[PDB]
């Protein structure tokens, strides 16, 4: 169940669901596995926010174990397309696709909570069929892996070689480790202590 | 869950769904597998949009792993029927049917995001029964494959022979490759 909230306005009281009310404050939630449906919803929300105010920063909270890549690339491209700076925050955990989106946030506006965990790994996939098709699919995933690593290095500042060595297997990072790795910028220990927003 | 948004017109406030609000701005979403119900819905949206303003361009966002062909043909035929230019945009991925609908957009209004992928392959099918029935269904799907290849060549500008060679097996294409292949027109990196 989703709670409903009342917003006071000059016209009168207005009724909203909790998620919609936050959207009014430029806040989006990326929870659960990344699929096509949730991604389009996030994409729709970002476009709507851009039109309302293309100068105000957007906030995207990330608690996800990852998922499809294509669904994630759509969100990444949308963030890099719009004018607003998409400030990414990590709550609970960020997996390979979640972490990729987290580092994709605007420079200096990528945050993690102190106990949040970030995991990065190379893409996963598979195919069953003839040898010819296997070569085609195997080549494609490798290109995806290369493309993803290039983007990660660009956002984190690290070298492409270092990223490849660290992504060969599941690598876990805490908020401090991530800051030193370039995945994020700072840590949101307290709202008023830092006042980044 | 689907978020609710507010539109502030002179007439007054109005509560809309995120998808419905975008539809008011001539934006359609083609997500998920292409089936008959979703396709029928997309057709209804196009017709509604055409009647509201048959001179403004319609936008169709595509993130799909493909699906039925009959459903796709309905969308394709509807796009070519209406007067408005249907600008197709690829987000995440376009499958064989998605790519077919993507390239079917208005010339010069087919876009693809940088990190998006495109996949084109020949139709899939099958039948179980007598040999007579098998031959019938086999001939039908082959005609479909020929028809699809002709349309792809007309929109992409390539030769029918090249399309047949490239669709014999799953072929993946990034945004740049798709541009060179005539499947799209340009790329949307940032907002100008």
């Amino acid at each position: 169940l989703v709670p409903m909230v009342i917003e006071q306005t000059s016209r009168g009281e207005r009724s909203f669901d909790i998620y919609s009310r936050l959207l009014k404050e430029r806040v989006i939630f990326l929870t659960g596995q990344v699929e096509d449906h949730m991604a389009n919803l996030i994409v729709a929300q970002m476009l709507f926010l851009e039109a309302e105010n293309p100068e105000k920063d957007i906030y995207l909270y990330i608690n996800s174990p990852g998922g499809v890549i294509t669904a994630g690339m759509s969100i990444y491209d949308t963030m890099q397309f719009i004018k607003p700076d998409v400030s990414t925050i990590c709550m609970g955990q960020a997996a390979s696709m979640g972490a990729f989106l987290l580092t994709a946030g605007a420079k200096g506006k990528r945050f993690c909570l102190p106990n949040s965990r970030v995991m990065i790994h190379q893409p996963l996939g598979g195919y069953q069929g003839q040898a010819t098709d296997i070569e085609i699919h195997a080549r494609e995933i490798l290109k995806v892996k290369g493309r993803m690593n290039e983007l990660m290095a660009l956002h984190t500042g690290q070298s492409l070689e270092q990223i490849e060595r660290d992504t060969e297997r599941d690598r876990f990072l805490s908020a401090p480790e991530a800051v030193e790795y370039g995945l994020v910028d700072s840590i949101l220990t307290h709202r008023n202590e830092n006042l980044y927003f | 869950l689907v978020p609710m948004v507010i539109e502030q017109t002179s007439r007054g406030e109005r509560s809309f769904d995120i998808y419905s609000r975008l539809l008011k701005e001539r934006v359609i979403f083609l997500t998920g597998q292409v089936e008959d119900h979703m396709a029928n819905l997309i057709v209804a949206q196009m017709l509604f949009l055409e009647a509201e303003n048959p001179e403004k361009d319609i936008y169709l966002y595509i993130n799909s792993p493909g699906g039925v062909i009959t459903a796709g043909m309905s969308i394709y035929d509807t796009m070519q029927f209406i007067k408005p230019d249907v600008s197709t945009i690829c987000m995440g991925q376009a499958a064989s049917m998605g790519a077919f609908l993507l390239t079917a957009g208005a010339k010069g209004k087919r876009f693809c995001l940088p990190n998006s992928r495109v996949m084109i392959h020949q139709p899939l099918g099958g039948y179980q029964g007598q040999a007579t029935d098998i031959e019938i269904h086999a001939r039908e799907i082959l005609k479909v494959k020929g028809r699809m290849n002709e349309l792809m060549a007309l929109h992409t500008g390539q030769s029918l022979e090249q399309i047949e060679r490239d669709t014999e097996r799953d072929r993946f294409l990034s945004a740049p490759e798709a541009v060179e292949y005539g499947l799209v027109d340009s790329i949307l990196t940032h907002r100008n």
Partner: peptide, 9 residues
Amino acid sequence: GIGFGATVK
């Protein structure tokens, strides 16, 4: 508008 093609203030 709101889409990619649409211009923003």
